[PDB]
Design a protein around this ligand. Structure first.
Ligand SMILES: [NH3+]OCc1ccc(-c2cccc(C(F)(F)P(=O)(O)O)c2)cc1
Length: 282
């Protein structure tokens, strides 16, 4: 079988080699480096590919999987929130998908600020959060939606739709069905917001660094990578892109941990199989 244990074993062999070779060395020229005392990386071993970095002071990467353009990042540190909101505003972000659980955010030991469910002030930026609809994705998994209105004196005010999956636990894979429902919700939300900008003649529409969905979980490598993979498979432009390609693109463009659990890779495989998409490059 193209999806049998042999093919799966080969896929894993290739991806493990790639993970091991992309592991960051100290002062690795492939990875963004902290400057001046301030912590950059939420986790020492989860680093940000230099070439695709979004801002010098964020652990955040531009990611293009086939034709699908997104930003993947870590959950921003408290000290990074002003820069994070500037990135969001500048990108005219059409959807911010947060996959870190409510339990994770509430646990102050993890230092995950509650930045999208509450209003706040971060340097010169003020942020207003409003709750909108709640959508069930299946298997009890829930998406809570918000809008974040980002203001700064002398800047255009920008509002960002948020899709928060609050009950996808760390180091797990939600089912292929839940994943497909989630990808559809996130793409639909982005599409609506992107259409508003287009209807207003925004110049962001012509700029491939902009209007990217922004996706983060805690580290930005497990749950984030499962969602990005699913989104890529929902994009009609990506015919024939293999699972090897998709995962190898996420890893070279962010870090080697992208798709963190075997069960996450298994959901990508099952979605591929459903479409008759190849696992391996010939
Ligand atoms: N230190 O070894 C590598 C390493 C270190 C930390 C993590 C990690 C830490 C927190 C959460 C997660 C994660 F749950 F996989 P996410 O889905 O948020 O990316 C992963 C994953 C890999």
């Amino acid at each position: 079988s193209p999806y049998g244990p042999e093919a799966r074993a080969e896929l894993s062999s290739r991806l493990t080699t790639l993970r091991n070779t992309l592991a960051p060395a100290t002062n690795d020229p492939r990875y963004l480096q902290a400057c001046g005392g301030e912590k950059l990386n939420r986790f020492r071993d989860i680093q940000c590919r230099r070439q695709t970095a979004v801002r010098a002071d964020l652990n955040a990467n531009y990611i293009q999987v086939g034709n699908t353009r997104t930003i993947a990042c870590q959950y921003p540190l408290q000290s990074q929130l002003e820069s994070h909101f500037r990135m969001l505003a500048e990108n005219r972000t059409p959807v911010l998908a947060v996959l870190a659980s409510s339990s994770e955010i509430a646990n102050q030991r993890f230092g995950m600020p509650d930045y999208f469910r509450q209003s706040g002030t971060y340097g010169s930026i003020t942020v207003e959060s409003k709750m909108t609809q709640q959508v069930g994705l299946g298997d009890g998994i829930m998406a809570d939606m918000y809008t974040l209105t980002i203001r700064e004196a002398g800047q255009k005010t920008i509002s960002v739709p948020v899709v928060h999956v609050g009950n996808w636990p760390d180091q797990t894979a939600v089912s292929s069905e839940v994943t497909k429902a989630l990808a559809s919700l996130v793409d639909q939300t982005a599409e609506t917001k992107r259409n508003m900008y287009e209807s207003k003649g925004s110049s962001a529409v012509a700029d491939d660094s902009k209007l990217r969905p922004v996706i983060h979980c805690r580290a930005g490598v497990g749950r984030t990578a499962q969602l990005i993979g699913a989104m890529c498979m929902n994009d009609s432009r990506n015919s024939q892109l293999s699972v090897e390609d998709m995962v190898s693109q996420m890893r070279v463009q962010r870090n080697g941990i992208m798709v963190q659990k075997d069960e996450q890779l298994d959901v990508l495989i099952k979605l591929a199989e459903g479409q008759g998409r190849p696992l391996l490059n010939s």
